[PDB]
Design an enzyme around this catalytic site. Structure first.
Site, mmCIF file in Angstrom:
data_model
loop_
_atom_site.group_PDB
_atom_site.id
_atom_site.type_symbol
_atom_site.label_atom_id
_atom_site.label_comp_id
_atom_site.label_asym_id
_atom_site.label_seq_id
_atom_site.Cartn_x
_atom_site.Cartn_y
_atom_site.Cartn_z
ATOM 1 C CE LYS B 59 0.602 51.315 31.702
ATOM 2 N NZ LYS B 59 2.052 51.362 31.356
ATOM 3 N N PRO B 167 1.168 48.001 22.862
ATOM 4 C CG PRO B 167 0.707 48.248 25.171
ATOM 5 C CD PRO B 167 0.392 48.850 23.787
ATOM 6 N N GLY B 168 1.994 44.672 24.106
ATOM 7 C CA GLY B 168 1.443 43.334 24.215
ATOM 8 C C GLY B 168 1.945 42.424 23.106
ATOM 9 N N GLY B 174 0.675 39.064 21.510
ATOM 10 C CA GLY B 174 0.354 39.845 20.328
ATOM 11 C C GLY B 174 1.285 39.625 19.152
ATOM 12 N N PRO B 176 3.166 41.139 15.670
ATOM 13 C CG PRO B 176 5.482 41.144 15.686
ATOM 14 C CD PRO B 176 4.301 40.209 15.771
ATOM 15 N NE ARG B 190 7.293 40.659 29.556
ATOM 16 C CZ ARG B 190 6.118 40.112 29.852
ATOM 17 N NH1 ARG B 190 6.053 38.998 30.584
ATOM 18 N NH2 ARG B 190 4.993 40.690 29.431
HETATM 19 O O1 BMP Z 1 -1.922 47.946 28.090
HETATM 20 C C1 BMP Z 1 -0.729 48.106 28.265
HETATM 21 C C2 BMP Z 1 -0.025 49.350 28.421
HETATM 22 C C3 BMP Z 1 1.299 49.384 28.608
HETATM 23 O O2 BMP Z 1 1.933 50.460 28.735
HETATM 24 N N1 BMP Z 1 2.051 48.194 28.658
HETATM 25 C C4 BMP Z 1 3.508 48.254 28.868
HETATM 26 O O3 BMP Z 1 4.206 47.947 27.703
HETATM 27 C C5 BMP Z 1 5.338 47.114 27.983
HETATM 28 C C6 BMP Z 1 5.109 45.765 27.339
HETATM 29 O O4 BMP Z 1 6.224 44.942 27.662
HETATM 30 P P1 BMP Z 1 6.351 43.434 27.149
HETATM 31 O O5 BMP Z 1 6.685 43.517 25.568
HETATM 32 O O6 BMP Z 1 7.558 42.892 27.811
HETATM 33 O O7 BMP Z 1 5.162 42.582 27.499
HETATM 34 C C7 BMP Z 1 5.570 47.197 29.477
HETATM 35 O O8 BMP Z 1 6.449 48.277 29.841
HETATM 36 C C8 BMP Z 1 4.156 47.455 30.001
HETATM 37 O O9 BMP Z 1 4.125 48.127 31.274
HETATM 38 C C9 BMP Z 1 1.436 46.940 28.500
HETATM 39 O O10 BMP Z 1 2.099 45.919 28.525
HETATM 40 N N2 BMP Z 1 0.082 46.972 28.315
#
Ligand code: BMP
Ligand code: BMP
Lengths: 209, 209
Positions: B59, B167-168, B174, B176, B190
């Protein structure tokens, strides 16, 4: 009122310059240029060797859960404070504040940045980011030396009791004296660490104010 | 179309989980939670051990000069790509692009974030950040799984030829399938790494799509 931004990338040079200017500072800002090159152990080494407070300038800017992890690793490494971006929102900042509370450390909130690009998106949100900090109980802030009129407005929002530090002095064009009209301390990197005589550069800054 | 967000903080666990799900991925996203705990050498170790491409999720959100240093250290460490924030402006992004060009690597531009706080300031600037990426020649982007209507608008701005990861998925809410209607790949942390059986979790995601 002078904080050294130690952005040299090799340990030997970083240690040399910091030792040469120790008498003129009491706080060293260590960021990713040095940490990603020499490792997180460099924070504890500096803290012990120079007895200076260390601000980890990591511009934390992730989601709450990741911010918590970053802050925990940073304070475990011995940092006294960490710089966090406010643009990602209140929950992301609160996550950092919660870890700082748990570990007896501090968070610095970065409001407006000093480089030209900051005018694109950050500047327009900066007053609101500062107000968010006040609402969240933040007491330490970072504002730009390159725009003293903005530093003045930010000081107005955070109050006189809040601690405000400011980068952009020297290389980026900012002036020590003018910046200190609003900030409590100035951050200086290249003007000191790239100087032929860092101690002479630091002493000159300390004298000009 | 599945990228593992390896945010475990200890090397042994990180290596265990990544090895267990290797057959379901080809790219691993490594961020500060792991790097600040185990060091930058973990990137080359993963790259060699698993033969996967590594995206360094740092980031990047500093001034141009510091961004250049961060990118250089990151690519020297073996990362194939680095994630950079667009909110700090075009000059900061260009600095990252210049280092990527010099080193034959790639930059991913983070537009809108996935957490609740992203609505405060980032969302309002996201379309413009994406347009800035297009104007700068950026071909890789990150957008939120938690707001598919925003992911759709971002896809509209960047075009079908651009690569978009998201992500999310899972822990943050979120889905898939819905996310892949717009993104080329989904990032999952996670839901996989905290699962009792990471391989089973990954396989389940791969099947649901
Ligand atoms: O908008 C964004 C950008 C990201 O990089 N991320 C990153 O993506 C990952 C999502 O992880 P998780 O599936 O556990 O919620 C984390 O490493 C987080 O820092 C996010 O969750 N949202
Ligand atoms: O708005 C900001 C915030 C910063 O932290 N900084 C940081 O402060 C330092 C300023 O260094 P320099 O005096 O060499 O320009 C760098 O470490 C940089 O990353 C900045 O320049 N502007």
């Amino acid at each position: 009122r002078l904080i050294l931004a130690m952005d040299l990338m090799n340990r030997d040079d970083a240690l040399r310059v910091t030792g040469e200017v120790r008498e003129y500072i009491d706080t060293v800002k260590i960021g990713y240029p040095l940490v990603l090159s020499e490792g997180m152990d460099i924070i504890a080494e500096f803290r012990k060797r120079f007895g200076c407070r260390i601000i980890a300038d990591f511009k934390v800017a992730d989601i709450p859960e990741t911010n918590e992890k970053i802050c925990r690793a940073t304070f475990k490494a011995g940092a006294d404070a960490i710089i966090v971006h406010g643009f990602p929102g209140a929950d992301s900042v609160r996550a950092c504040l919660n870890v700082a509370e748990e570990m007896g450390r501090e968070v610095f909130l970065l409001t407006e940045m000093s480089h030209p690009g900051a005018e694109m998106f950050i500047q327009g949100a900066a007053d609101e980011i500062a107000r968010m900090g006040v609402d969240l109980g933040v007491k330490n802030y970072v504002g730009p030396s390159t725009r003293p009129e903005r530093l003045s407005r930010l000081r107005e929002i955070i109050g006189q009791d809040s601690f405000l530090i400011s980068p952009g002095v020297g290389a980026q064009g900012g002036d020590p004296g003018e910046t200190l009209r609003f900030a409590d301390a100035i951050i200086v990197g290249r003007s000191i660490y790239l100087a032929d005589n860092p101690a002479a550069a630091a002493a000159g800054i300390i004298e000009s104010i």
